[PDB]
Amino acid sequence: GQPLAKDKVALLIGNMSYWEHPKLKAPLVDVYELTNLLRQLDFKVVSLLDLTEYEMCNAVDEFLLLLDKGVYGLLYYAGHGYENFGNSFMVPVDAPNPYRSENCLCVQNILKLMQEKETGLNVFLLDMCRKRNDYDDTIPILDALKVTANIVFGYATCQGAEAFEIQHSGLANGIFMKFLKDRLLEDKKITVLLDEVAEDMGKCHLTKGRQALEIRSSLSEKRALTDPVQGAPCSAEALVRNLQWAKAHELPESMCLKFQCGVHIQLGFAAEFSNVMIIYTSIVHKPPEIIMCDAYVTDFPLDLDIDPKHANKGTPEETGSYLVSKDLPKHCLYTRLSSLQKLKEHLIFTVCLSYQYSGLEDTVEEKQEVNVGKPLIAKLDMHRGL
């Protein structure tokens, strides 16, 4: 009668800042919007941007760890893709020019791993190009898939075609997401809903005859992304899974910093993606003996490679964040820490105070070290083991 979900887990990757290839823009925005939509459908979501091949492999391993018998598993990828000899390939940021299958992740490999975990659903939304990488010599010779009638593909374009994004100087959006976002929340069967998305996508003028949605499905059960989650977890195995999820979306506590000079510095943290965190420094209290003072954040772990142009900015938008000034507490100094999947170490930075005393020219510098542990996805220890 009613199809049920043991859990609903999603892994969303958005690559933009390619090292050897044209950088993209819509992946950030699309990822942000899919997460919010997928959360409304009660999904355990993992949002990640600009992953390298190694990094990409670990996100799949963390995602696989969250899938068990009956769990609805969804994968969304927005970035560079190629299709060779019936295999789809997602291209990581670190990819060389020219690249091969070795340099890339094969979707079919991810699918097999999911089937090994007895998942109820296997949805794949590949928002990438699907042309031949003429430079790819290697043909993976992959093992046959087990017939499980729960596999669903939402290809943004068709084989040998391109998926497009509108790069309008402001936000920038992806074409697949423009038609998907308005229909995702519907209680239709996943296949039926994807096909209704395909119709509205044909009505697109910008892409007509260049990009069309391609649905491939084996699904033989009225399963949908709206299907309810087996009420009371109460199972020991179900409890381990909720801990493992919670382990990745832990944000540092908004601390207050007291300085030897009697100055108070409020330190706030915001979440943008599992990979992205925003710090803000507000000067909450200062003694009468000091009137001039600016608080600034420095000495970040070199693993993170934090550009100075993305740190200590008057507004969050100046750091590159998708989050806007109405979402983030007003008047602080905002700093964007993307690439947390690069943190092997514990997060330690210095909150540096440059100040001045009444009636003196000299500029005083009070540096205070801050250890915020492993925020968000850093806490998963993706670099763990030998």
């Binding site: 044209p22 927005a78 943004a156 391109e162 497009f164 994004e165 892409t207």
Partner: peptide
């Protein structure tokens, strides 16, 4: 409108 550019490709991916």
């Amino acid at each position: 409108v550019r490709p991916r």
